[PDB]
Amino acid sequence: DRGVSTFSPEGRLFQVEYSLEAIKLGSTAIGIATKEGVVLGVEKRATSPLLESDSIEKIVEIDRHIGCAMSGLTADARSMIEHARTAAVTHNLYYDEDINVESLTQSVCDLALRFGEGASGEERLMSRPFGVALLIAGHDADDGYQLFHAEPSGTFYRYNAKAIGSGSEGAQAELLNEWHSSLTLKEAELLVLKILKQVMEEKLDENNAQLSCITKQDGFKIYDNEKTAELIKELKEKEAAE
């Protein structure tokens, strides 16, 4: 609507608020973070049998130990992904050191939150305004596994589990009690599938759901799809036992 200068009588920019509305529209992405690894799951989404589910991807490795999921406006995200990759490889050159997942996010936010129709201190190559969320996950040595929520309104928040998209409203409440410090790997896998099932109409099956993980030892690893299939099957056995 209104200018980059224009501030609301609420206090917050107009642009920023309109941007929040989009995220709901975008894909359901849920993470649970644990100290043996972060587990990420996304509905890849089928809408026609013609559409080739397998070809498209929603989780993309930016680094050999950092992966990213996108929810929101998928047009904007092409840039985001390309900036990210660039940033990570700049540090790897300069310092030859673990890609802090914290430092990678900080680079990202300079690029994202710098819209303006003309600035005189800063290069304007943006007009409007990068309204996209990313859940930025990985391991960095010093501080172990991290998971951030990248926010178009301002400073990123660290999370221990977070749920975004269409299914956020139901999921997020669930995540308050069920997130605990006794989720091992095995549990974390199962739990994400569980929530994802209840809150989305789209039937959980591997042709439209996919899992991913970060183990420092093997790096960011996108799972083969056979693996995924076995897990969906164990889940069903436990839901039908109770």
Binding site: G3, S5, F7, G11, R12, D110, L113, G118, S120
Partner: protein
């Protein structure tokens, strides 16, 4: 009405409606109190989380060895200003063998702000910083306003429920100024100042994070056990 869609037309009021709206993000900001003695200067700030599971995110940024700030209002506008205070400190030291003065900082910050509301477009600002620093004349507290008005005070509060902190500073001026060479009694004093703004909240190590710079102390952000004694 057209004067809050512009920033190039004087309002009838005499000062842009846009600059007043901007102020309101500040009050939506975290309640932060700032106060000083001649010797030391302390900021006490509330960190805010966005979920129970979410960890608290630091609302005090370290600018330099001998400086830092606490912010209330817009985050985007903040990134630019945090870098500019580092650019200033780094220049003064390298070039002139002299760390930056808080007196100087505020004035250069006024001008830059004012130039960006005057011009078409650009970036007006919507963040208040309470900047502490240790200079030649000891520790000081400056109040930065996005409007571009700088005043050195011995105490202020920005954010919400500023009434209770305001009463605290107004009372304890005469008692705290006199208290000097004591970083500790003065830090304690700030935790008591913030107690009044808060209603129906725990005062805990997690909530509060306290910064100090003065004659004795370099800039240090205290968390955990470091604030546990003074609560």
């Amino acid at each position: 009405n057209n004067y809050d869609g512009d920033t190039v037309t004087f309002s009838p009021t005499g000062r842009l409606f846009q600059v007043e709206y901007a102020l309101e993000a500040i009050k939506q900001g975290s309640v932060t109190v700032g106060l000083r003695s001649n010797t030391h200067a302390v900021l006490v700030a509330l960190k805010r989380n966005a979920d129970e599971l979410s960890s608290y995110q630091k609302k005090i940024i370290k600018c330099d060895e001998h400086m830092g700030l606490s912010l209330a209002g817009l985050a985007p506008d903040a990134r630019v200003l945090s870098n500019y205070l580092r650019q200033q400190c780094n220049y003064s030291s390298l070039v002139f063998n002299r760390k930056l003065a808080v007196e100087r900082a505020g004035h250069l910050l006024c001008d830059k702000a004012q130039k960006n509301t005057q011009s078409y477009g650009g970036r007006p600002y919507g963040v208040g910083l309470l900047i502490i620093g240790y200079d030649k004349s000891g520790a000081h507290l400056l109040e930065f306003q996005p409007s571009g008005n700088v005043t050195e005070l011995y105490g202020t509060a920005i954010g919400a429920r500023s009434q209770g902190a305001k009463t605290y500073l107004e009372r304890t001026l005469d008692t705290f100024i006199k208290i000097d060479g004591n970083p500790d009694e003065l830090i304690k004093a700030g935790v008591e100042a913030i107690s009044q703004s808060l209603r129906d909240e725990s005062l805990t190590v997690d909530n509060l994070s306290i910064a100090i710079v003065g004659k004795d102390t370099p800039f240090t952000i205290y968390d955990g056990e470091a604030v546990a004694k003074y609560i």
